[PDB]
Design an enzyme around this catalytic site. Structure first.
Site, PDB file in Angstrom:
ATOM      1  N   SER A  54       4.990   2.673   8.230  1.00 12.86           N
ATOM      2  CA  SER A  54       4.570   1.414   7.962  1.00 12.86           C
ATOM      3  C   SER A  54       5.989   0.690   7.881  1.00 12.86           C
ATOM      4  O   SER A  54       6.981   1.065   7.135  1.00 12.86           O
ATOM      5  CB  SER A  54       3.965   1.150   6.556  1.00 12.86           C
ATOM      6  OG  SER A  54       2.626   1.985   6.840  1.00 12.86           O
ATOM      7  N   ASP A 109      -2.147  -7.098   1.379  1.00 11.71           N
ATOM      8  CA  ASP A 109      -1.585  -6.005   0.838  1.00 11.71           C
ATOM      9  C   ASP A 109      -0.072  -5.581   1.039  1.00 11.71           C
ATOM     10  O   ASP A 109       0.347  -4.774   1.320  1.00 11.71           O
ATOM     11  CB  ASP A 109      -2.476  -4.672   1.444  1.00 11.71           C
ATOM     12  CG  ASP A 109      -3.966  -4.621   0.874  1.00 11.71           C
ATOM     13  OD1 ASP A 109      -4.157  -4.888  -0.211  1.00 11.71           O
ATOM     14  OD2 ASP A 109      -4.762  -4.512   1.672  1.00 11.71           O
ATOM     15  N   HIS A 144       0.881  -1.186   0.182  1.00 11.73           N
ATOM     16  CA  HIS A 144       0.015   0.179  -0.062  1.00 11.73           C
ATOM     17  C   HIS A 144       0.840   1.451   0.046  1.00 11.73           C
ATOM     18  O   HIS A 144       0.529   2.307  -0.416  1.00 11.73           O
ATOM     19  CB  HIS A 144      -1.007   0.129   1.114  1.00 11.73           C
ATOM     20  CG  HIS A 144      -0.161  -0.164   2.632  1.00 11.73           C
ATOM     21  ND1 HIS A 144       0.404  -0.894   3.049  1.00 11.73           N
ATOM     22  CD2 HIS A 144       0.005   1.205   3.478  1.00 11.73           C
ATOM     23  CE1 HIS A 144       0.781  -0.540   4.173  1.00 11.73           C
ATOM     24  NE2 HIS A 144       0.583   0.801   4.435  1.00 11.73           N
TER      25      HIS A 144
END
EC number: 3.4.21.90
Lengths: 52, 49, 162
Positions: C113, C61, C39
């Protein structure tokens, strides 16, 4: 042609199922953080002999 | 005449050709169910933790 | 203690995901395999790793790739020992409870992330992919692996991509 078309759709659906099946197998395989899933392959044996 | 719509023949052969259609549909139905079953196995394996 | 944890993080080689000079996430190697948040847009801060072809994982993802043995010589150490208590990560401490990670509000945001969570032994127990504001605190969306080797992703309802 109608019967052939129906069979064609079935083949496509089967292929789609196969691809989703490969995903289902790979899901638990992610890596996994370990690089060792001998026994996951030994049980499921989804295919693609992995590896050495 | 006569001249009716059975439609027309030929039993054996009629069934032979009829049987050829729908089988592949059943297969993908079975595969669909099996795929869901496997998915639930994975979901259970994840929920195991 | 957090200082020592950061020191281990400094020893641990990590590479941000650069796009137009902006870090949109992080990617690193654990168990001798590269992982990257899909993502997140951009490319890893490592040409050698970038040279590697990745595989996609829509389910989570995420993308991943195999790391050359010579590069596997030194990678992150994962463990399945995930008892309840407190762990450490880049952004300070984190509470682990109910199989979920929670931290004080204002901690964690888009671009974080890929940040892993370490135990006292410096072993990886989970990786942070996102999170969501939860009042005085925030709940992290993470992936962790049980002793059965099963990939489990914990994602709060309507969790934001952090």
């Amino acid at each position: 042609s109608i019967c052939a078309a129906i069979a064609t759709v079935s083949v496509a659906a089967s292929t789609w199922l196969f691809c989703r099946s490969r995903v289902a197998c790979l899901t638990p395989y992610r890596l996994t953080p370990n690089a060792r899933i001998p026994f996951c392959l030994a049980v499921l044996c989804c295919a693609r002999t992995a590896r050495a | 005449h006569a001249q009716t719509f059975t439609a027309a023949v030929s039993k054996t052969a009629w069934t032979w050709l009829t049987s050829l259609l729908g089988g592949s549909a059943v297969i993908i139905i079975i595969g669909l169910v099996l795929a869901t079953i496997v998915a639930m196995y994975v979901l259970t394996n994840q929920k195991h933790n | 203690k957090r200082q020592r944890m950061v020191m281990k993080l400094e020893s641990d080689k990590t590479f941000p995901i650069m796009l137009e000079g902006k870090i949109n996430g992080y990617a690193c190697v654990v168990g001798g395999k590269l992982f990257r948040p899909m993502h997140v847009e951009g490319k890893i801060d490592n040409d050698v790793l970038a040279a590697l072809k990745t595989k996609k994982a829509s389910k989570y993802d995420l993308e991943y790739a195999d790391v050359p043995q010579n590069m596997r010589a030194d990678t992150f150490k994962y463990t399945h020992e995930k008892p309840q208590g407190y762990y450490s990560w880049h952004h300070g401490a984190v509470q682990y409870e109910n199989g979920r990670f929670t931290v004080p509000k204002g901690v964690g945001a888009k671009g974080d992330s890929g940040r892993p969570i370490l135990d006292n032994q410096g072993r990886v127990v989970a990786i942070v992919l996102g999170g969501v504001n939860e009042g005085s605190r925030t709940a992290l969306s993470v992936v962790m692996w049980n002793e059965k080797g099963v990939t489990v992703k914990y994602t709060p309802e309507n969790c934001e991509q952090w």
